[PDB]
């Protein structure tokens, strides 16, 4: 599930807003009972002392989110602009949040949250989910069908 944060003013937030979200799944179990499982979430977010959005990042979940969006976008348009767009997503995450002085590549450093993530894009740009060659059309379609239904720890291995 993807979301966008509208919030056209910075001061819309309730006091120390914990950003509530609820999911309601209404499934059916083979015992003969219709089931409604509901889960709720709360993420305290974005107080004016700056950084907080970035320490909460985890390099593994957003890597899979970028993979699923890239696979859908190769289904809609051609692959070459998907690689250009997705590499643009790397270079704008790094050029913001990396530890550097401008025009001085030797001072580069990366935080522990923002460190394994560029390797997850090196192997994603090299994995069969993005290029279609060296693979039959059924060999590629078997990978994309499994990938869209996979747990987050069941996906970085892919």
């Amino acid at each position: 599930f993807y979301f966008e944060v509208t919030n056209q003013q910075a001061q819309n937030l309730p006091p120390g807003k914990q950003s509530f979200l609820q999911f309601q799944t209404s499934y059916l179990h083979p015992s003969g009972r219709r089931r409604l499982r509901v889960t709720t979430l709360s993420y305290r977010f974005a107080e004016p002392n700056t950084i907080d959005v970035a320490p909460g990042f985890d390099q593994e979940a957003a890597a899979v989110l970028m993979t699923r969006l890239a696979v859908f976008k190769t289904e809609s348009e051609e692959s070459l602009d998907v690689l250009r767009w997705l590499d643009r997503k790397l270079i704008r995450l790094v050029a913001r949040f990396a530890d550097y002085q401008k025009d001085d590549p030797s001072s580069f450093h990366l935080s522990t949250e923002f460190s394994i993530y560029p390797q997850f894009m090196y192997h994603l740009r090299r994995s069969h989910f993005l290029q279609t060659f060296n693979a039959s059309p059924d060999e590629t379609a078997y990978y994309r069908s499994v990938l869209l239904r996979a747990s987050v720890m069941n996906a970085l291995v892919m």
Binding site: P48, N49, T50, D52, A54, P55, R96, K102, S111
Partner: protein
Amino acid sequence: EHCLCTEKLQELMDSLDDNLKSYERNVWQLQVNVLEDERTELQMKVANLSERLTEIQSKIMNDPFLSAKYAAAGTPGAVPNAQTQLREASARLALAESVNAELERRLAFERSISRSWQTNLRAMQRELREHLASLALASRKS
């Protein structure tokens, strides 16, 4: 050099005023605030420890027979007799486990001091970098 610096020096001032002085407010306050939590919890653990050592202390020795158990003690003589040094190593054992608890509560609460000087300071490097480099980019325009 009135070279339209004004719209980009002002938005450097906006960042340097609401963040430079104000982050220093909130993290000095955070450092102090958990250290009154030091004062309260240290005073509570003095309170119940002195309450135990005013309870069993009165109980044992305001009555004569159990007081005379200490008057015997493990005796004020040498040759520990293979019993009252099992006593003594156990006394050093509870002495070591008590300060082990005090240093570990010290340890985890020293992390609340230390794990705030990585992050909010870093974004001050970050957004002072974007505003400063945009200032240099606009300076090389006219």
